[PDB]
């Protein structure tokens, strides 16, 4: 089974490009990272920064996680990210996504490595 750390990388890391290229970025990346296999994963976020910069966030601002746990960290700086959201018509196995490029602060939950 892949570990939680590996699934985090698969589902969210895209250090190969600095930002979403085109409106077809979500469509391609959701399929590519295998997120449209059994089902259409409804929402996903890709971070366009080095893995090192993303792992470093675990030593940045401590904040509460949405579930109330206390192991969440907020990046000090804004990061290049791409939000992928399933359109209303999209139907498995024809998964359609809207792509939104933005520069934001990410909040990650951290665990031992």
């Amino acid at each position: 089974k892949e570990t939680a750390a590996a699934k985090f990388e698969r589902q969210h890391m895209d250090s190969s490009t600095s930002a979403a290229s085109s409106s077809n970025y979500c469509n391609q990346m959701m399929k590519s990272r295998n997120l449209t296999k059994d089902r259409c994963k409804p929402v996903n976020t890709f971070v366009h920064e080095s893995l090192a910069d993303v792992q470093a966030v675990c030593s940045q601002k401590n904040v509460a996680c949405k579930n109330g746990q206390t192991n969440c960290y907020q990046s000090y700086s804004t990061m290049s990210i791409t939000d992928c959201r399933e359109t209303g018509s999209s139907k498995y196995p024809n998964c359609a996504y809207k792509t939104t490029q933005a520069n934001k602060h990410i909040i990650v939950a951290c665990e031992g490595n």
């Binding site: 750390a5 985090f8 675990c58 939000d83 909040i107 939950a109």
Partner: peptide
């Protein structure tokens, strides 16, 4: 040591 396991949110 400490590594990201979940993306809780953006901004």
């Amino acid at each position: 040591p400490y590594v990201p396991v979940h993306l809780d949110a953006s901004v």
